[PDB]
Design a protein around this nucleic acid. Structure first.
Lengths: 133, 138, 177, 35
RNA sequence: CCAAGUCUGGGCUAAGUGGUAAAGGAUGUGGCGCCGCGAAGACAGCCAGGAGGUUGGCUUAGAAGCAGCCAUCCUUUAAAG
């Protein structure tokens, strides 16, 4: 029933992992060696973990796919937002490109319809700096 | 109502030194504003100021218009002592004729500017009247 | 709407609940009637901005209403109004308003704004023939631009009791452009 | 404290009357409003 | 105290105001108009979720309502903050 923000390729630090887990009924040694299995592939980037124990003092559960923010930047070719939204809008795109990017985001998107899919991309666009023209 | 020596012999023909009129933004109906009732050679300075601090707290759209402006002034200590007093000027303004059209917080729906002016009254000096115009304030 | 009186009694009248207000019309007038309570309501609507009329003895149910008056006094509560009808096909002195919307150009992007020394529009279209609410806003706003008379853009009734190039409504720096 | 000129802190700080007196009150030592 | 109605009528005071004062405050109190509703059975008590794309931009070393400068939109649904 805990939530952490552990690093990658380092499953032995006493300062954070020690007190934050040991007092909650979690064996620090064994819970750490299990991470050296799934975080070894994508080592280097901080990966948040959500450990959930029971009444036997064990388990590991859901650690992680990755980023989904930097790959969108690679396509457009803007890092970060320009400045402040609704004051310096200068990044227009088109209608047809916003239509196909929402068709794959459906799993974590609002509803499985086509009208509701285009409406979320309208809210997160104007809150940053991507006006649809 | 003691006033000055003339509009060009004593002290008449100035800019009075201040910070112009208009601010805020337009607005066809919404009548948002401020006026008074008090009589007082409105304290220039105090004046100029005040109003300004007004913009200081808001910024843009809310007729930060303001229909005032001094243009005459007092005088006192300079020379011998107290007797035959020549005159040394300082502090012009204008008579706030027992109430009248002050400055205007004029605009559609932008009370975010009403409160402003408000802050504008707070300031000022001679009490002030908080009000609306033909229609009110929306 | 209703409003009565017309004898010769302004003081007390000019007092209480009934405010003076002459019965003005091309050719004839008649003691002041009305009331300090009707003025309210109606007036509250949009005096010389739309128009109606009241039934005093069913006399003459006509429009034209007010072409003058004042909440004068300091207090800011009118007293002593003017009233003139128009059962004619000459209706000229017609001053009805004009509204925009907010079209985004200098504002919701440039923060800039715009003064409208205009708003109203005393003209003279088709007498007893005007849309109590006429709107016209070709948009545009920002930098050192300005629009006024000249351009404008008048629909139907071709009057203009006004002139060209003059207090239309421009866009100024609510801060800086 | 301010004896003169008290007006509502915390989004609660109440308006009470003791001895006709008006002294601010609200779940905070940082409100001990009094006049 | 000192001469003369502890007159009658109907309001308003709960501070001794009366018996000196301003800016400035506050469901004091009494009398007048407005917006929403109580059988879409209404504000304040109580049961509950206390919704998701919201975890957007400057600064990020931290905005991601609960540092602050700009946004202020979309939603599958019991509605939206």
């Amino acid at each position: 029933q805990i939530k952490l923000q552990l690093p990658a390729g380092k499953a032995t630090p006493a300062p954070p992992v020690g007190p934050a887990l040991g007092q909650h009924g979690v064996n620090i040694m064994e819970f750490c060696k299990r991470f050296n299995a799934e975080t070894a592939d994508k080592a280097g980037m901080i990966l948040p973990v959500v450990i959930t124990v029971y009444e036997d003092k064990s388990f590991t559960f859901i650690i992680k796919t990755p980023p989904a923010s930097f790959l969108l930047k690679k396509a457009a070719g803007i890092e970060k937002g320009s400045s402040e939204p609704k004051r310096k809008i200068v990044g227009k795109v088109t209608r047809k490109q916003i239509e196909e990017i929402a068709k794959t985001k459906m799993p974590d998107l609002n509803a499985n319809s086509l009208e509701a899919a285009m409406k979320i991309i309208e809210g997160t666009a104007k809150s940053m700096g991507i006006e649809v023209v | 109502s003691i006033k000055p020596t003339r509009r060009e012999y004593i002290s008449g023909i100035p800019g009075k030194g201040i910070a112009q009129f208009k601010m805020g933004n337009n607005t066809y109906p919404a009548q948002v504003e401020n006026v008074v009732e008090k009589p007082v050679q409105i304290r220039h300075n105090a004046l100029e100021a005040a109003r300004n601090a007004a913009n200081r707290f808001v910024q843009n759209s809310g007729k930060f218009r303001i229909r005032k402006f001094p243009f005459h002034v007092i005088r006192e200590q300079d020379g011998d002592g107290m007797r035959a007093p020549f005159g040394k000027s300082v502090g012009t303004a204008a008579r706030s004729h027992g109430a009248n059209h002050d400055f205007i917080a004029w605009v559609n729906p932008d009370p975010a500017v009403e409160f402003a002016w408000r802050r504008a009254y707070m300031k000022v000096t001679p009490t002030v009247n908080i009000d609306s115009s033909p229609a009110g304030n929306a | 709407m209703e409003l009565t009186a017309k004898p010769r009694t302004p003081k007390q009248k000019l007092d209480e609940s009934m405010i003076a207000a002459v019965a003005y019309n091309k050719e004839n007038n008649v003691s002041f009637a009305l009331d300090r309570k009707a003025f309210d309501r109606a007036f509250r609507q949009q005096s010389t901005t739309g128009l109606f009329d009241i039934t005093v003895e069913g006399g003459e149910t006509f429009p034209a209403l007010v072409k003058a008056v004042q909440m004068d006094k300091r207090k800011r509560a009118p007293i002593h109004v003017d009233f003139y009808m128009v059962t004619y096909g000459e209706p000229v002195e017609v001053s009805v308003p004009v509204h925009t919307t907010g079209r985004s150009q200098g504002e919701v992007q440039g923060g800039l704004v715009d003064i409208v020394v205009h708003n109203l529009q005393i003209v003279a279209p088709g007498p007893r023939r005007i849309p109590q609410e006429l709107v016209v806003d070709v948009t545009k706003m920002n930098i050192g631009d300005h629009i006024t008379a000249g351009d404008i853009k008048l629909p139907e009734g071709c009057t203009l009791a006004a002139d060209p190039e003059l207090t239309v409504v421009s866009v100024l720096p609510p801060r800086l452009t | 404290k301010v004896r003169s000129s008290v007006k509502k802190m915390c989004d609660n700080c109440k308006v009470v009357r003791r001895h006709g007196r008006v002294l601010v009150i609200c779940s905070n030592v940082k409100h001990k409003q009094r006049q």
